[PDB]
Amino acid sequence: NLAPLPPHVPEHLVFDFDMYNPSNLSAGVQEAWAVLQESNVPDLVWTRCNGGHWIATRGQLIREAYEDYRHFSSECPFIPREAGEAYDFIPTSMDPPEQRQFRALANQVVGMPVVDKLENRIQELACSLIESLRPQGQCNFTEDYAEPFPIRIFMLLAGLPEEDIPHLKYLTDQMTRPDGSMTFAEAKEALYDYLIPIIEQRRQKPGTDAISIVANGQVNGRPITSDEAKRMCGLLLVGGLDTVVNFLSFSMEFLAKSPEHRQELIERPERIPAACEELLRRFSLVADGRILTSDYEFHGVQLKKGDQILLPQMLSGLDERENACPMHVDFSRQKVSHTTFGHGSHLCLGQHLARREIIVTLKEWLTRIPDFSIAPGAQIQHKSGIVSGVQALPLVWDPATTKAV
Numbered sequence: 001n002l003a004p005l006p007p008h009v010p011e012h013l014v015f016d017f018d019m020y021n022p023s024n025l026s027a028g029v030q031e032a033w034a035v036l037q038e039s040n041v042p043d044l045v046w047t048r049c050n051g052g053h054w055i056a057t058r059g060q061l062i063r064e065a066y067e068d069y070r071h072f073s074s075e076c077p078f079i080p081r082e083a084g085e086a087y088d089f090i091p092t093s094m095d096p097p098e099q100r101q102f103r104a105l106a107n108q109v110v111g112m113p114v115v116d117k118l119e120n121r122i123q124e125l126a127c128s129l130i131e132s133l134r135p136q137g138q139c140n141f142t143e144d145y146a147e148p149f150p151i152r153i154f155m156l157l158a159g160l161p162e163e164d165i166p167h168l169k170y171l172t173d174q175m176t177r178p179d180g181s182m183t184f185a186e187a188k189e190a191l192y193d194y195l196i197p198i199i200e201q202r203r204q205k206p207g208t209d210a211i212s213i214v215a216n217g218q219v220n221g222r223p224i225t226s227d228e229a230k231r232m233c234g235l236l237l238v239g240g241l242d243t244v245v246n247f248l249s250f251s252m253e254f255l256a257k258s259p260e261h262r263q264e265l266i267e268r269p270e271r272i273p274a275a276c277e278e279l280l281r282r283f284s285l286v287a288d289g290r291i292l293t294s295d296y297e298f299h300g301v302q303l304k305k306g307d308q309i310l311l312p313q314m315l316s317g318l319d320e321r322e323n324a325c326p327m328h329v330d331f332s333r334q335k336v337s338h339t340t341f342g343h344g345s346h347l348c349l350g351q352h353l354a355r356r357e358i359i360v361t362l363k364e365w366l367t368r369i370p371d372f373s374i375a376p377g378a379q380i381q382h383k384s385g386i387v388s389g390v391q392a393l394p395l396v397w398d399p400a401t402t403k404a405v
């Protein structure tokens with residue numbers, strides 16, 4: 001249902017897009033969001049769905065807003081408003097200047113040098129999973145690879161038992177694509193319930209896992225509090241359990257449907273890093289936003305203090321004003337413009353981990369299973385939310401065409 005239009009919002013800018021269930025979802029989630037960029041549609045629209053909020057539809061406005069933290073605060077970054085208000089993860093719920101000391105701590109646990117440390121175990125895991133699947137001639141890609149591969153890497157980094165995944169994965173999903181059984185506040189409270197005793201424990205007896213590092217850490221040279229450590233560790237869990245997991249399934253679905261693209265990467269595997277970046281553009285998948293700190297005129301539209309504005313990271317690279325023929329995947333694309341990992345001071349801290357996981361996946365999969373397709377008859381369904389994903393991805397191949405390494 002539709003929230004009554006506020007007096008300040010002009011009627012001609014109303015476009016009732018539902019970020020948790022977009023109209024055109026059956027055509028693909030990126031396609032469904034791209035309807036906001038059809039010729040009829042202003043650069044900035046108001047939807048009455050999900051309590052009512054602005055949506056910037058073009059990369060120019062999305063970038064500008066993400067740069068301007070004085071007008072567009074990350075204190076309430078999720079729609080609906082109750083989710084945004086409850087949202088308190090660190091660093092994302094904080095604006096500069098105080099945000100920054102916390103980013104620096106987070107970088108000690110997910111930064112380039114840590115990923116270099118993880119490199120061999122990331123490869124080993126990719127390979128053990130793929131080799132196991134290779135002979136079977138089929139898989140449920142979401143559950144058999146996309147989920148276990150990035151998630152087990154995160155649980156290893158965090159020093160958490162793998163048997164805790166189904167519970168944590170359920171909770172993180174309720175924050176990004178809720179099935180209605182939990183509010184965001186409830187899911188958050190449960191993630192923190194899980195974390196609290198582990199944080200206390202690791203402050204007492206420090207290990208070398210990510211939770212210990214964060215929990216015993218300093219920010220601008222003063223000790224982090226247990227509450228700060230919990231708000232940072234929660235976010236890290238979310239990043240680990242619901243980002244790359246979804247992205248891998250979009251990419252593999254595309255490769256399953258497009259032999260010429262796989263052929264290109266089999267014939268020339270040096271192109272894989274560039275292909276990674278182009279898939280990160282075409283199959284971009286995050287959309288969160290900001291809250292207005294004051295009344296502010298933006299691109300000829302009056303915004304009011306407290307208005308929420310969705311700034312979909314997904315849309316920038318799909319914008320035909322950033323990338324010609326945006327829905328086409330071109331591994332040779334000369335200037336791959338996107339905001340897939342965000343923009344401004346909250347630029348994704350996990351992006352180095354994410355690119356390593358994706359590139360290792362592409363290399364190792366195509367090396368063993370170069371020819372595969374979607375199970376015949378399977379109608380692939382996407383799902384939309386703060387992070388979008390794929391419900392299920394049944395794949396099939398002829399074992400005879402595979403190669404053990």
Ligand code: HEM
Pocket residue numbers: 074077090091092093099103106110154235236239240243244247285286288289313339340341342343345346347348349350351353354
């Ligand atoms: C394909 C994978 C990924 C995508 C597309 C993605 C995207 C994003 C986006 C758009 C933001 C900015 C949100 C905002 O401005 O409100 C962000 C921030 C963040 N990301 Fe990622 N991310 C991914 C992977 C990961 C991973 C694997 C981790 C951790 C293991 C992670 C950790 C974080 C953290 C801690 C921040 C907050 C930075 C801040 O608020 O200063 N990311 N990411």
Ligand SMILES: CC1(C)[C@@H]2CC[C@@]1(C)C(=O)C2
Pocket residue numbers: 089092176235238239243286288386387
């Ligand atoms: C929007 C995000 C992808 C980014 C990292 C996890 C996530 C859901 C957040 O709350 C911040």
Ligand SMILES: [K+]
Pocket residue numbers: 075076077084085086087088093
């Ligand atoms: K908040």
